[PDB]
Amino acid sequence: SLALSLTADQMVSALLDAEPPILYSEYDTRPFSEASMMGLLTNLADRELVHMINWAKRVPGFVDLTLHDQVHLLECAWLEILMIGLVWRSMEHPGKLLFAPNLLLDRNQGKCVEGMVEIFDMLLATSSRFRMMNLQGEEFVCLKSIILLNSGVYTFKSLEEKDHIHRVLDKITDTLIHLMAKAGLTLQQQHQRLAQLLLILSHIRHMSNKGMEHLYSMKCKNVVPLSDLLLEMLDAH
Amino acid sequence: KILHRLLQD
Numbered sequence: 230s231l232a233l234s235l236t237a238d239q240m241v242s243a244l245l246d247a248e249p250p251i252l253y254s255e256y257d258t259r260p261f262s263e264a265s266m267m268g269l270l271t272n273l274a275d276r277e278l279v280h281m282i283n284w285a286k287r288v289p290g291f292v293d294l295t296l297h298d299q300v301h302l303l304e305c306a307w308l309e310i311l312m313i314g315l316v317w318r319s320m321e322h323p324g325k326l327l328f329a330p331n332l333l334l335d336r337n338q339g340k341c342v343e344g345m346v347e348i349f350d351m352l353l354a355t356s357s358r359f360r361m362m363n364l365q366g367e368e369f370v371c372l373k374s375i376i377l378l379n380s381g382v383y384t385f386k387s388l389e390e391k392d393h394i395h396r397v398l399d400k401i402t403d404t405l406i407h408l409m410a411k412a413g414l415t416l417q418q419q420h421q422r423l424a425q426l427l428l429i430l431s432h433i434r435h436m437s438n439k440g441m442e443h444l445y446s447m448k449c450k451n452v453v454p455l456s457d458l459l460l461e462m463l464d465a466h
Numbered sequence: 467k468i469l470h471r472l473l474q475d
């Protein structure tokens with residue numbers, strides 16, 4: 230299907246063109262309470278999810294899947310995707326997390342919410358790693374698409390579906406290497422960098438699982454209400 | 467459910 234016959238450059242363009250916008254937090258912005266920070270983030274994540282759902286539809290290969298499979302992948306991947314986005318946006322702000330242009334939080338503001346500073350620290354470490362690696366926008370969009378396709382693929386005939394996903398994943402791998410080769414990296418450097426990028430995805434998975442625990446923990450405590458969509462996505466884990 | 471709506475829009 231369409232996705233498999235795209236060139237590397239066509240794949241990258243498609244992914245770049247699919248990028249969701251950067252959203253703003255609610256401006257309504259004093260020193261933060263636990264409940265207020267929670268409220269801001271919850272509201273922001275909910276709005277972001279709507280844009281992510283529409284981004285996913287523009288990822289070549291994704292709409293080729295059945296609705297059930299698209300749902301499964303999104304339910305598995307959504308928090309990883311929010312996280313890698315956050316980490317990407319925060320690259321140019323060492324020591325801080327750019328949740329939105331009007332919501333740039335440092336580590337100590339992570340203490341406003343109980344158990345949040347752990348996840349913050351992991352996110353900050355990920356941002357540093359991307360900076361140390363000099364991650365490029367074109368690489369980022371590839372990684373984000375890999376997360377979408379990879380994260381639920383092992384937990385599904387639902388075999389020709391798996392094969393298609395694995396074929397798309399192979400295409401994105403080709404695209405990543407292409408980009409590295411164009412940037413003038415040696416063969417050795419290309420396979421080394423590819424490995425380094427993909428190994429970070431293990432850490433992103435870990436962060437997602439910790440964040441999901443945290444999110445379920447805040448639901449039980451009913452400290453702020455979660456949106457219907459967030460609760461739907463959370464229920465899927 | 468909501469996911470289904472948003473995926474079909």
Ligand SMILES: NS(=O)(=O)c1ccc2c(c1)[C@@H]1CCC[C@@H]1[C@H](c1ccc(O)cc1)N2
Pocket residue numbers: 266267268270271273274277311312314315328342345348349440443444447453
């Ligand atoms: N404190 S909460 O109100 O329980 C709550 C609500 C939403 C969220 C969280 C936590 C976790 C905590 C770390 C960020 C993360 C997350 C988030 C929000 C916006 C993003 O672009 C990325 C991620 N959503």
